[PDB]
Amino acid sequence: MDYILGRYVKIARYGSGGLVGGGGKEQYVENLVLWENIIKTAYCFITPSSYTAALETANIPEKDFSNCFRFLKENFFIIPGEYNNNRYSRNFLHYQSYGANPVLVQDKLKNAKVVILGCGGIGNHVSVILATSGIGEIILIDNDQIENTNLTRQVLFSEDDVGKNKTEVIKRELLKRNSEISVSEIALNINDYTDLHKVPEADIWVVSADHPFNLINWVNKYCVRANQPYINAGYVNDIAVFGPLYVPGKTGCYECQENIDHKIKLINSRFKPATFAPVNNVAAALCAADVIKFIGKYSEPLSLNKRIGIWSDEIKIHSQNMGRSPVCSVCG
Amino acid sequence: MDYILGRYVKIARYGSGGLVGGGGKEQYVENLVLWENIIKTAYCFITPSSYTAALETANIPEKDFSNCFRFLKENFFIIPGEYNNNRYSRNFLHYQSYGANPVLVQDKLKNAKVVILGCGGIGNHVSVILATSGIGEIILIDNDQIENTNLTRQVLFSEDDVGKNKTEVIKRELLKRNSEISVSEIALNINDYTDLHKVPEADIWVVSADHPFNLINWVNKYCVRANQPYINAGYVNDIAVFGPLYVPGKTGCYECQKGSEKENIDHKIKLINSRFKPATFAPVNNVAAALCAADVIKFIGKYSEPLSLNKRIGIWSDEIKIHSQNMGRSPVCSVCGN
Amino acid sequence: MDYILGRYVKIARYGSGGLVGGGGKEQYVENLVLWENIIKTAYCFITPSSYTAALETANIPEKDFSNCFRFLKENFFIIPGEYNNSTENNRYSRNFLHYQSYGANPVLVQDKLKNAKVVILGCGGIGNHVSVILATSGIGEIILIDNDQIENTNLTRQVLFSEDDVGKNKTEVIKRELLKRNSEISVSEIALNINDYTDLHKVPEADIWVVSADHPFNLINWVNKYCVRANQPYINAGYVNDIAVFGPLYVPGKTGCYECQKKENIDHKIKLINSRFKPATFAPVNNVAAALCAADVIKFIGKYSEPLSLNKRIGIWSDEIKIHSQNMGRSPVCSVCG
Amino acid sequence: MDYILGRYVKIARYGSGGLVGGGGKEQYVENLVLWENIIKTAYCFITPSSYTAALETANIPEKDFSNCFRFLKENFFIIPGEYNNSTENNRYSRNFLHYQSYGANPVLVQDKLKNAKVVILGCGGIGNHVSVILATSGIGEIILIDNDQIENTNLTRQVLFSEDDVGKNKTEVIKRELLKRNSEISVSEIALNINDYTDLHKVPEADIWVVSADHPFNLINWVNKYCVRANQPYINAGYVNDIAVFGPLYVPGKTGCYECQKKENIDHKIKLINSRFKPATFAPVNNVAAALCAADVIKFIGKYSEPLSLNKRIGIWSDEIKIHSQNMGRSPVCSVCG
Ligand SMILES: Nc1ncnc2c1ncn2[C@@H]1O[C@H](COP(=O)(O)OP(=O)(O)OP(=O)(O)O)[C@@H](O)[C@H]1O
Ligand SMILES: Nc1ncnc2c1ncn2[C@@H]1O[C@H](COP(=O)(O)OP(=O)(O)OP(=O)(O)O)[C@@H](O)[C@H]1O
Ligand SMILES: Nc1ncnc2c1ncn2[C@@H]1O[C@H](COP(=O)(O)OP(=O)(O)OP(=O)(O)O)[C@@H](O)[C@H]1O
Ligand SMILES: Nc1ncnc2c1ncn2[C@@H]1O[C@H](COP(=O)(O)OP(=O)(O)OP(=O)(O)O)[C@@H](O)[C@H]1O
Ligand SMILES: [Mg+2]
Ligand SMILES: [Mg+2]
Ligand SMILES: [Mg+2]
Ligand SMILES: [Mg+2]
Ligand SMILES: [Zn+2]
Ligand SMILES: [Zn+2]
Ligand SMILES: [Zn+2]
Ligand SMILES: [Zn+2]
Numbered sequence A: 001m002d003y004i005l006g007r008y009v010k011i012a013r014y015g016s017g018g019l020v021g022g023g024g025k026e027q028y029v030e031n032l033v034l035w036e037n038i039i040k041t042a043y044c045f046i047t048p049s050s051y052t053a054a055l056e057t058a059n060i061p062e063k064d065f066s067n068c069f070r071f072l073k074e075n076f077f078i079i080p081g082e083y084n085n086n087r088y089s090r091n092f093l094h095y096q097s098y099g100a101n102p103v104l105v106q107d108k109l110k111n112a113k114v115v116i117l118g119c120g121g122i123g124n125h126v127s128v129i130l131a132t133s134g135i136g137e138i139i140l141i142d143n144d145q146i147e148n149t150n151l152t153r154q155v156l157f158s159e160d161d162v163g164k165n166k167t168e169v170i171k172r173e174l175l176k177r178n179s180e181i182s183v184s185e186i187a188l189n190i191n192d193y194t195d196l197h198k199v200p201e202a203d204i205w206v207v208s209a210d211h212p213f214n215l216i217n218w219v220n221k222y223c224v225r226a227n228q229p230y231i232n233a234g235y236v237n238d239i240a241v242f243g244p245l246y247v248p249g250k251t252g253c254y255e256c257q258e259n260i261d262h263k264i265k266l267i268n269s270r271f272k273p274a275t276f277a278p279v280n281n282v283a284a285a286l287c288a289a290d291v292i293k294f295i296g297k298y299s300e301p302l303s304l305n306k307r308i309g310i311w312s313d314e315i316k317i318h319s320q321n322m323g324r325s326p327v328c329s330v331c332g
Numbered sequence B: 001m002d003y004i005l006g007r008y009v010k011i012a013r014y015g016s017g018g019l020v021g022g023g024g025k026e027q028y029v030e031n032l033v034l035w036e037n038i039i040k041t042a043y044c045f046i047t048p049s050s051y052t053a054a055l056e057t058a059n060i061p062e063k064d065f066s067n068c069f070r071f072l073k074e075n076f077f078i079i080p081g082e083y084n085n086n087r088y089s090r091n092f093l094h095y096q097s098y099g100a101n102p103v104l105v106q107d108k109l110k111n112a113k114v115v116i117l118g119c120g121g122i123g124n125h126v127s128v129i130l131a132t133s134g135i136g137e138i139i140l141i142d143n144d145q146i147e148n149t150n151l152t153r154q155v156l157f158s159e160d161d162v163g164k165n166k167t168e169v170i171k172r173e174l175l176k177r178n179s180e181i182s183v184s185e186i187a188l189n190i191n192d193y194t195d196l197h198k199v200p201e202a203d204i205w206v207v208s209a210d211h212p213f214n215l216i217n218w219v220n221k222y223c224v225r226a227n228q229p230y231i232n233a234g235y236v237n238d239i240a241v242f243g244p245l246y247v248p249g250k251t252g253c254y255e256c257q258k259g260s261e262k263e264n265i266d267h268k269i270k271l272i273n274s275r276f277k278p279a280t281f282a283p284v285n286n287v288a289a290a291l292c293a294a295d296v297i298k299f300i301g302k303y304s305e306p307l308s309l310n311k312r313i314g315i316w317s318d319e320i321k322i323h324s325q326n327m328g329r330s331p332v333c334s335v336c337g338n
Numbered sequence C, D: 001m002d003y004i005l006g007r008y009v010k011i012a013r014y015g016s017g018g019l020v021g022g023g024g025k026e027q028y029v030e031n032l033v034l035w036e037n038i039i040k041t042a043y044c045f046i047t048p049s050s051y052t053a054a055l056e057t058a059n060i061p062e063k064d065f066s067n068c069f070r071f072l073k074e075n076f077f078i079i080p081g082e083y084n085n086s087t088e089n090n091r092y093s094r095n096f097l098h099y100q101s102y103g104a105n106p107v108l109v110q111d112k113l114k115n116a117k118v119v120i121l122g123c124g125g126i127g128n129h130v131s132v133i134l135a136t137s138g139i140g141e142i143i144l145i146d147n148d149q150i151e152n153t154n155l156t157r158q159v160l161f162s163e164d165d166v167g168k169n170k171t172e173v174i175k176r177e178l179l180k181r182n183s184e185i186s187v188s189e190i191a192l193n194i195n196d197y198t199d200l201h202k203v204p205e206a207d208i209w210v211v212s213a214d215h216p217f218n219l220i221n222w223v224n225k226y227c228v229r230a231n232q233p234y235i236n237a238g239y240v241n242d243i244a245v246f247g248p249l250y251v252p253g254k255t256g257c258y259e260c261q262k263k264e265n266i267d268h269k270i271k272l273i274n275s276r277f278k279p280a281t282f283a284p285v286n287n288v289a290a291a292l293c294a295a296d297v298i299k300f301i302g303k304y305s306e307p308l309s310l311n312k313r314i315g316i317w318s319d320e321i322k323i324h325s326q327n328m329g330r331s332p333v334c335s336v337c338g
Helices: A032-043 A051-058 A062-074 A089-097 A102-110 A121-132 A148-152 A166-177 A193-198 A215-226 A261-269 A277-296 B032-044 B051-056 B062-074 B089-097 B102-110 B121-132 B148-152 B166-177 B193-198 B215-226 B263-274 B282-301 C032-043 C051-057 C062-074 C093-101 C106-114 C125-136 C152-156 C170-181 C197-202 C219-229 C267-275 C283-302 D032-043 D051-055 D062-074 D093-101 D106-114 D125-137 D152-156 D170-181 D197-202 D219-229 D264-275 D283-302
Strands: A002-005 A011-014 A017-020 A027-029 A078-080 A113-117 A137-142 A182-187 A204-207 A230-236 A239-246 A306-310 A317-321 B003-005 B011-014 B017-020 B027-029 B078-080 B113-117 B137-142 B182-187 B204-207 B230-236 B239-246 B311-315 B322-326 C003-005 C011-014 C017-020 C027-029 C078-080 C117-121 C141-146 C186-191 C208-211 C234-240 C243-250 C312-317 C323-327 D003-005 D011-014 D017-020 D027-029 D078-080 D117-121 D141-146 D186-191 D208-211 D234-240 D243-250 D312-316 D323-327
Touching: A011 B263, A017 A032, A027 A032, A032 A051, A032 A062, A032 B263, A051 A062, A062 A078, A089 A102, A089 B148, A102 A277, A113 A121, A121 A137, A121 A166, A121 A204, A121 A230, A121 A277, A121 B282, A137 A166, A148 B089, A166 A182, A193 A215, A204 A215, A204 A277, A215 A230, A215 A239, A230 A277, A239 A277, A261 B011, A261 B032, A277 A306, A277 B121, A277 B282, B011 B032, B017 B032, B027 B032, B032 B051, B032 B062, B051 B062, B062 B078, B089 B102, B102 B282, B113 B121, B121 B137, B121 B166, B121 B204, B121 B230, B121 B282, B137 B166, B166 B182, B193 B215, B204 B215, B204 B282, B215 B230, B215 B239, B230 B282, B239 B282, B282 B311, B322 C186, B322 C197, C011 D264, C017 C032, C027 C032, C032 C062, C032 D264, C051 C062, C062 C078, C093 C106, C093 D152, C106 C283, C117 C125, C125 C141, C125 C170, C125 C208, C125 C234, C125 C283, C125 D283, C141 C170, C152 D093, C152 D125, C170 C186, C197 C219, C208 C219, C208 C283, C219 C234, C219 C243, C234 C283, C243 C283, C267 D011, C267 D032, C283 C312, C283 D125, C283 D283, D011 D032, D017 D032, D027 D032, D032 D062, D051 D062, D062 D078, D093 D106, D106 D283, D117 D125, D125 D141, D125 D170, D125 D208, D125 D234, D125 D283, D141 D170, D170 D186, D197 D219, D208 D219, D208 D283, D219 D234, D219 D243, D234 D283, D243 D283, D283 D312
Parallel strands: A113 A137, A113 A204, A137 A182, A204 A230, B113 B137, B113 B204, B137 B182, B204 B230, C117 C141, C117 C208, C141 C186, C208 C234, D117 D141, D117 D208, D141 D186, D208 D234
Antiparallel strands: A002 A078, A011 A017, A017 A027, A230 A239, A239 A306, A306 A317, B003 B078, B011 B017, B017 B027, B230 B239, B239 B311, B311 B322, C003 C078, C011 C017, C017 C027, C234 C243, C243 C312, C312 C323, D003 D078, D011 D017, D017 D027, D234 D243, D243 D312, D312 D323
């Protein structure tokens, strides 16, 4: 078999040796001689080569070459030549760097179906990422119409779209960006649990709809019954939220873990979130990544068994545990 | 003077007492009696009311009312009624929650001019947040045309836009979303340090251009000499990066914390790096662009401290991980020690 | 204005009269009549009372009541009633009596701690112990600096670490454990080993650096040089075998710095012996040094009592009953700060 | 017949001569030539060497060598070669250098600890800190006695406990936490509140009891009387507000016991004031008392150095640099042990 150097591999002289790779998998090789040999080895795989052929070309001791080849291979700095090959080419570099076959990942995305339940801030941003990453079918669910105030966060919408159906404009704008995918709309506000039967089975549901307060509870109980994976995303004012990502039988579910009354109920009935496009976009982006990773199967979604928050007025990411509980009211 | 309960405040009975507020400002008050007083007081300011007028309707001691009033006012859960007097409505709740007068914040955004240096994935997402938040003038700078591969992250672009100038298409799409603002383009590629004088002065530069490796170093040197604020944003493969936000005389600069000697290794390094293409991913791009844009809005708006002052911040995407690189002022810096 | 008796006040019959207070503030009152007058005055303040209301309650002459009131007030045995704040959450409730006993309003001390940043430079034996005291006392932002992984031998004193944690990064496990203990604060990490002086620019500004990193032997001299130049407060803590050491607490422009009071056939032999040095670590010694270090930090930021280690290197013996202090006052002939 | 230089040995040129050793054993040798000779001699024992083998590599007269050998041996700067015969990988290896420096064979000290049993009577701030030190130094059996559950307020000092632990038995969580740190030892619990002297019979025989339970006030008096009658060694530790306190360490027939050196109107006022007493807790003070308590336990059982609190109650101040010992020497007169 042939191997090839990933284009995502950068090399830098640093400290007593140097760096190989960039991002999460960046390696610090302290020993300069080892680092120089890794360079000599990587050089042989810029164009695809078998191990024996590169061994000849590199002209360093076989034991050293074997060391360097192994190091490059384990970190997916060099990859099976078969994994090399296109509109998705940049995403391919991503899948490659996790040690996946991008063609198999792309095929999984192409054959997947994603429900977007809620086509507001989060729906807009999640739906574009998924569509342009080649998710084969996207179903858009909302009964609301576009308003001028939506435009701060709802990136697919224009001034001219005010008054039109949310699902209609998303579908239009999605197809402008990737005409290879199929998009559906369902004009549907979930008023009671039974309405969830109108939401089709899919690989995963992206749930950002937020009214009423126990919508997420209905969705959860429904999806546990239906063996339907879903992921929740949103915000609480300045905090971006994504997760949990519920996987039937594998992860925990959402549930696992008086004249004062009319005053609290009144105050809470008037609540409107004080939030911010950047907050919205962070939640949606990380939600979309967990969806791609879940369907593509190349890396573990972050929000399995977790509800993750990202703060905007300080530097902070924190997770609330949503691990499985054998005493759970809904699952088990 | 009237005060009013912000609509972004919510309350929950919790533990021994309860929670007041949502998000980063949320307060847990363990004492039941005190929590119950804070909500009763909050309730009196649902309609815009002076302290005395609200107190008239309350049925708790005057001294408890004051304590609670003080608590609410300090956390910006109640605000001057004038602050609540529009496309930017949702943004207004945000500003209010930081104790700011949203009309004054909005006017500062209206009077602002922002340079978008680099109109790729970062520049796409930043420019549209800025435009729809009412930044008054935006200047688009790039010399590249759209390619089909751009579409995974460059959210303003359609299939039909392949081959067109990125600046042209961004402008079209921004004015489609906010016709109340001013957008202009400069077809420029920064080739040398000496090209930077061709970039206009602005409230801030959003720098996401990345070619060659030392462009950021030239931008830093120039902006330090020019008294020009800038923010850098981008990614390193799977790591979303924003910062530093350089502010003349206030923060450190990019350089405050600042191939091969063997020829047969050097040329191998150079070829490898010439073939470099980042292994990244819309979610990574979008996180960096979003936090960048938040820092621009806060820097201009003045209502909250931008996160990337004195910091280059990385957000990992395959782990729960955020780390900061120190970019505080060095009194020995070879660029900003004026 | 109400006054209230501190709960930390202790009274006992002793000698010819009695003792008032416990700890550093304990006072032997030989005169029985004045001792009895002190307790009669104190008795009026168990529940909060004004000077005048209490004056009428006491069976003692105005003259004697005045003397006894001032006695109690000046020793902070009675404190302003507002300092009691009985209805605080409270995570930190236990610490309040300590602040009260020094005449401070605990809620104001608590606020200073919440608004502080502390860098822990070195996340070993000393770092474990200091960081946890600081986190649970409510220092608002803690920055963990180290590049080392946990080893089984670390477990004798690196209290936050479990057998299960061997192999993991020290900063990551400390962060995890600190947030399990106090979810209300912020913790961050920097994967960094100071290899030369210039790596110190990678350590951010904070209210104070807690320095227990010890490799190489002159790391402390680099740190000192940097902090003087950077106007950065720091406290050093560690041990010399069986003696626990904390201090100096360097304060820019207030204290001396670390350097202020500073053949042929031998040199190679001296170098060799010293290059082999390993401290005789012993948890009790480590823990004492870390504890008193942490006290000086809390007091430095809290401002309610003088840190012990201002202008001083303090050693506590473990095989003798002994504490000795080494002067580290300013020198005009100092090569670093003179 | 081999000797080896201690790894804990350091030297420095100082004054007219130099320093040898670090910690309590540091010696200043004013004579340059003598100091130089000690270095040359110490150098000869870096590798494990007999007196004769080392002397053959020394470039100094045998009389000078003999005297330097004697100085090094007396101070345990050089130790028997076999005392260094364990793995650097032994979990207790750091403690081993500590034992070496006191002239003990670390394997034998460790054997004594492995076979010891220690009762922890009181699982609050002191018991938390003592128990982990003892667990991770290799005390073979630890018995935890308390009847309280974990509260939010505990977390300031109670280092083994976390927010999630609230509501759980103190002893259950300590056990879990101790075994996570050292799975090579045995840890038991007894749910017991000592309500009267008669309850002390339910506390197991052990090598020593660590006593930090504090309620009622005469609990120490009960413990002392029982232990004297039951021939049971015990150490007391705690605090009196800002003063850390450890001792006495009672050893049947070898030390004094606790009681050795010991209108109705104001009487009732005294009682109510004292009934109201709550210590001004502060983690640094707690941890100091616990650390030195633990040191005394390890030395009592290890037998390599004298526990400090034999015949003494020792106070360490926190707001001044001060350590003081109250005599608790044996009295023939004593009503309890006399
Ligand atoms: N029960 C529900 N069924 C279907 N869609 C829902 C339900 N509840 C909420 N949604 C939709 O989910 C989306 C939530 O997104 P978002 O709140 O950003 O939009 P919005 O409500 O128009 O904006 P704003 O709250 O600022 O007016 C909305 O489009 C809303 O119509
Ligand atoms: N020196 C420079 N001067 C001006 N613009 C620049 C310079 N270097 C880079 N840019 C621009 O900054 C943007 C970088 O964004 P990005 O890399 O996401 O886009 P891209 O290059 O089209 O995509 P890809 O890197 O996937 O090919 C590009 O539009 C590029 O043209
Ligand atoms: N120059 C340096 N930069 C950063 N961290 C350092 C430096 N020198 C020492 N440290 C860190 O400071 C800590 C010192 O603590 P300590 O010596 O108790 O731990 P240790 O070195 O792991 O243990 P031992 O000395 O018993 O092997 C270590 O965690 C070490 O990694
Ligand atoms: N008579 C007794 N019998 C058994 N255990 C006791 C007795 N008296 C006290 N204790 C225990 O000894 C410990 C004393 O330690 P400490 O006072 O630090 O703990 P705490 O009471 O949890 O802390 P705080 O008093 O600050 O709330 C407590 O855990 C307490 O339950
Ligand atoms: Mg909505
Ligand atoms: Mg590019
Ligand atoms: Mg060390
Ligand atoms: Mg207690
Ligand atoms: Zn469940
Ligand atoms: Zn600079
Ligand atoms: Zn000095
Ligand atoms: Zn006695």
